[PDB]
Paper text:
GAPDH is a critical enzyme in the glycolysis pathway, and it mainly localizes in the cytoplasm. Malfunction of GAPDH lowers cellular energy generation and triggers cell death. GAPDH function is highly sensitive to the redox environment within the cell. Prolonged oxidative stress oxidizes GAPDH, which is subsequently translocated into the nucleus and initiates apoptosis.
We applied oxidative stress to genome-edited HEK293T cells and purified endogenous GAPDH from cytosol and nucleus separately after 8 and 24 h of oxidative stress. We further determined structures of cytosolic and nuclear GAPDH from oxidatively stressed cells. Interestingly, by analyzing structure of individual subunits from all GAPDH datasets, including the one without oxidative stress, we captured different conformations of the GAPDH catalytic site. In one conformation, there is a density connecting side chains of C152 and H179. We name this conformation as inactive subunit. By counting the numbers of two types of subunits in all structures, we observed an increase of catalytically inactive subunits in both cytoplasmic and nuclear GAPDH upon prolonged oxidative stress.
Residue numbers in the entry:
A (entry chain A), B (entry chain B), C (entry chain D), D (entry chain C): 2 to 335
The structure:
């Protein structure tokens, strides 16, 4: 039996999580809450996508409900998360994806509405973080509020886990070249505390600070205090790339690194970590469900103890599919 | 003596109007009001521009005032326009540029603060409209609230005036290919009543409805009910182009049209309407102060009574310079 | 029995024609000629596409042949079209898509190699032009060299045919907003006779002259001398739009135009002319196989005799699918 | 007395070198050779620029000569560099900028035409390399063929020189995020030996291999074998950024690094290496003449021996100004 999932917020992450849930069939969506989008606008927003194309299926509105592939979905319009009746709609798990309730106390308001477990699709200050394929076996059913970290952490963590297991990362610095997001502006406009992010996204790349490489040390406890980095935001649509420059404890030629990464991508991390040797570019990874894909031909090594590794990730489809996979594993553990 | 000007709102139009005022020297800026931008952020926003480059001069903050080229400017942070003390700062004219006070009643709240005349840098439902070089001689000193129409109206009106004076436009339809603005979104996001405008600006052109060609009939009364059109919003930075397809009462070869447009651009409409015969593109008109520049080589004529005319305009610098010119003419009429 | 097709040139049009042929299954590709692309580079170029995504199927190289979905394809590397042995490979029809052999004499060199009929996927000065759904019933088996006009002609001709059949177009002018093509440059570079086309495609829109609206009069003989127009080349990837401003002989409200266009798109022109009433943008028509899709909400009418109609087209997939459909009809007529 | 300079090739580098020479006034241009551009097309190409705007001055053609600011320039159309009469035009130095004569033997053909010294504006396999402000004092008048390395080497070398002089770089890896160049394609097209570079520049970032960090070891001999790296090519117009991840022999806090970089940018490396602490983006460095500008706020340090440094560079204006400065120093050494 599939678990029943409600979604709070119909932004980019909520719509793509609903799309991934209906495409994979692992979980069932029964309720969506958004206070600023009405039903017909939800139909229009779900049906058409500039990046991932039209939805393969039927979506319509009937009797005040959103019907996707013949499945009706209840729609709520509450602005206070403590007043949403999740239990009346039958939702067992709730995906919090608005990005403003990230603490345990703020995201715990969904438990008052009748939900059982809450999954935060964002980095959290105090909720435990789980990344699929890295530390998701440490989950137990006593935990009620779960965080899934972010897209950059989900790209960096499996590759760093493989490299640290085989060669012992001593210290590393990460640079990610990121696509544009919803928090940026088309022209030069006002941004409150981040002055670089208010500049025009079409004409410039923004060197942005990120905390994903530090969160890898929270997901992998042996790498705590050994990773940090920054970001650049280039005017491109969807696909981002992580560049990790690291120092290794044991000697490692580049062919050995390629061999162990390919071996990990075949058996244990299948569907999470990818491997390729072709002359790929960014748009070759559009609508790819992998967390990260190792680029063998793009990296370079200075010597046996100082390497630079390149990994591609779709920061839209991969993260949503990992949210669905985490919910499926959580339902299986019950 | 130059007139004293206050600016309400430090958005794109307000900053570019301040830049044009300090570059041309026709008017003097003494006060700026914005409730969401503090002083140091005003210094940063005025100093750096992605489109028009760095400011040629000195800008700094001292004693709670914005000093530009040695000239101090008082800063207000009021959110209610009736409580701004324009008379204490010495501001005689006030440019309303926030885009939310466009009616006569809403924009008349600046008169309670001590201002003499208010100029709206937007289309208005009930305030009189004036376009420089077309109908600006109809202004008199009894009028207190003035509208300057928009950038597309300021591009279309002088060319339509010349063509109607020489050949008698019977009917016309306008298509403008517009650059991206601040109301658009980088990715697919929510827009309230305009569903097409919420889609991603980097990946698609939006067929948007505009009322500029109808407002030309309000500026030129003989063309009332003979012009309408639409718009496209392509992913480009700054320069837009107007394509006017019209039918003429009298026969007109294309060389005669070129001759009368060049003659008008030399003597009477100098600095407002431009003329070129070179193989120009859009970025050749970056930071151009003309209202419109007629492209001789780009247009086409089917016969002697059915022509298509092409005109370029910078919808950022040209409109701000026209606001400054209108204020200078208003001060001269006193 | 499907007809056997050879393709000369593996550029954008040749690769997309091969993709459309394998996706639809109407014709069979048996031979490809290109003097500058070797076999493994053909595999790489066919497998990956930045615009239309990865190929849904298997493509590989074996025994000096290109195997697509289990079908082997002979590869030629000749630079002279008279020396290609089309008859040895079994190719009955030949698609000439290099863009340099467009006259009847130059494209007739493929007949010496053993081909039966040659189809030019470009406008031609002397070869007869056929557009599917408009004048393709005028083809007979005595003709050997056929032209399929271009993408803009294939978008404009069915809509103009419907409007002229129902209301009598008197005169019209067309503006198309076109996506970037392979003849443009990334930065400012040298172009021989077209100085505007040598400028940077990412930063500017080029007002380009086109002959598609004049070629509509060659496809529809009653509209000869009544249509002409120009073009703009905006920095976007794939989808273009045609704006037709026309004058009608009989009175026509906009609802009547919508009714007759929807009626034509249902029955007779099904799959060629589309109809929509949704709030669509350009990326909603990516990988769409229609020749043209009428946008009901985007157009505008000044009065009963002067209208402006908007039509979307994918200038990559639609034209290739029309080439395949024309070849299927030509094979059926034998 | 200013030295007389001829330019071979009127591509991007040649036009920008001519523009920098006329803007700075250090050298005098007397002759330009290009076999594919005629005189009026040279006037059009020099007058208009999409990136750097219109030329501030007068440019025209008279008597078969290119007159810039009242200075006449002889035009040659030879395709063989041994047949260009540089001595008849009076050119003493010759800038070879076509990018196809980079060896000493191929670039020595200009000496047969009457030139004295040849400067290659590209990396060279056997000609000596000089970077202004780093090793340009090692030049002597016995040398006849000189290379100026590339834009990325000119950005990386002064910062690496300062950091190695103060703290002792042990090993380092460089990632540069580069703007698009003339060798890329607008859509997916054929590229011979570099399959990634043939993909569409507007829709994807290309991980490209570069040899600039290895050439730094040729310019600074103590860093030989300690630096290498790669590149990404994002769809942006003009400004690139270098990210250097290095390990230091002596302990260095980030404030000490900022102090020594600011001290070097003030006195010795004035005009070559810049320093800023503002919240800058890429378009803030458009038409900047510095070789590199250190970004203090964008970098990050993991500990006292492992840092990441960020430097901005205009890869068009800065390199051309360094070519002009190298020619001025070479003329002063005579």
């Amino acid at each position: 039996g599939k678990v029943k999932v409600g979604v709070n917020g119909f932004g980019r992450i909520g719509r793509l999580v609903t799309r991934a849930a209906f495409n994979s069939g692992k979980v069932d969506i029964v309720a969506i809450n958004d206070p600023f989008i009405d039903l017909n606008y939800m139909v229009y927003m779900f049906q058409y996508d500039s990046t991932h194309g039209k939805f393969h299926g039927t979506v319509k509105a009937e009797n005040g409900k959103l019907v996707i592939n013949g499945n009706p979905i209840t729609i709520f319009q509450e602005r206070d998360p403590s007043k949403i009746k999740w239990g009346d709609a039958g939702a067992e798990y709730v995906v919090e994806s608005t990005g403003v309730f990230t603490t345990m106390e703020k995201a715990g308001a969904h438990l008052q509405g009748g939900a059982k477990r809450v999954i935060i699709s964002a980095p959290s200050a105090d909720a435990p973080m789980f990344v699929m394929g890295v530390n998701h076996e440490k989950y137990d059913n006593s935990l009620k509020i779960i965080s899934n970290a972010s897209c950059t952490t989900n790209c960096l963590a499996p590759l760093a886990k493989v490299i640290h297991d085989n060669f012992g990362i001593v210290e590393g610095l990460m640079t990610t070249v990121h696509a544009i997001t919803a928090t940026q502006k088309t022209v030069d406009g006002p941004s409150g505390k981040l002055w670089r992010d208010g500049r025009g996204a079409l004409q410039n790349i923004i060197p942005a600070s990120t905390g994903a490489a530090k969160a890898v040390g929270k997901v992998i406890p042996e790498l705590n205090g050994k990773l940090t980095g920054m970001a650049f935001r280039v005017p491109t649509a969807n696909v981002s790339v992580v560049d990790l420059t690291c120092r290794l404890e044991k000697p490692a030629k580049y062919d050995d690194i390629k061999k162990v990464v390919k071996q990990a991508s075949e058996g244990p991390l299948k569907g999470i970590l990818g491997y390729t040797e072709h002359q790929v570019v960014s748009s070759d990874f559009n609508s790819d469900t992998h967390s990260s894909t190792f680029d063998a031909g793009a990296g370079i090594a200075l010597n046996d103890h100082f390497v630079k590794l390149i990994s591609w990730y779709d920061n839209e489809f991969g993260y949503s599919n990992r949210v669905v996979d985490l919910m499926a594993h959580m339902a299986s553990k019950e």
